[PDB]
Write a protein that binds this ligand. Structure first.
Ligand SMILES: Nc1nc2c(ncn2[C@@H]2O[C@H](COP(=O)(O)OP(=O)(O)O)[C@@H](O)[C@H]2O)c(=O)[nH]1
Ligand SMILES: [Mg+2]
Ligand SMILES: [Mg+2]
Ligand SMILES: [Mg+2]
Ligand SMILES: [Mg+2]
Length: 156
């Protein structure tokens, strides 16, 4: 079956692990050791297609085929840091055309300090999709990962 190597990047505490575990294990982690970096695998169906996802949950690469660049909507600094991660990815892949998706996580929270204009304008600056997620409620989580897969499909 088709295989896709995904990588989740972003500042500490944004929800990289929570997003990954919601996808892989279907549950929300209220805490997850910020030092655990691992790959997590799952056979899934995306748009009817059976495939294998291999997801690298990073902690603060070269074989990654698509990247989620994650910030938290209640963490301005995490948004500022997105550019460092995007550039890291461009360098590690030696390419400007790497599939990626901008993810604004923790959208369940009312304490928003990165607005929807900021996020949408950044995504337009990168020419990539922006997806609002909550690892807590599961809103957007499949959409974020699967959109990335569809970006890899396009790229292939
Ligand atoms: N309210 C809320 N909290 C979240 C969400 N995603 C992650 N968290 C919490 O934010 C903290 C850091 O998440 P974690 O996945 O460890 O972030 P990482 O350092 O990027 O892996 C944890 O306490 C999570 O339970 C979310 O969508 N909403
Ligand atoms: Mg983590
Ligand atoms: Mg491992
Ligand atoms: Mg099918
Ligand atoms: Mg502001």
């Amino acid at each position: 079956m088709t295989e896709y190597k995904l990588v989740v990047v972003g500042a500490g505490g944004v929800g990289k692990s929570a997003l990954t575990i919601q996808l892989i294990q279907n549950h929300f982690v209220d805490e997850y050791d910020p030092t655990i970096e691992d790959s997590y695998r799952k056979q899934v169906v995306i748009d009817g297609e059976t495939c294998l996802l291999d997801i690298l949950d990073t902690a603060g690469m070269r074989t990654g085929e698509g990247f989620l660049c994650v910030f938290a909507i209640n963490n301005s600094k995490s948004f500022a840091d997105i550019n460092l991660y995007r550039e890291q990815i461009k360098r590690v892949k030696d390419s400007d055309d790497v599939p990626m998706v901008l993810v604004g996580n923790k959208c369940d929270l009312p304490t928003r300090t990165v607005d929807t204009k900021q996020a949408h304008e950044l995504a337009k600056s990168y020419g990539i999709p922006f997806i609002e997620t909550s690892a807590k409620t599961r809103q957007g989580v499949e959409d974020a990962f699967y959109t990335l897969v569809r970006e890899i499909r396009q790229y292939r």
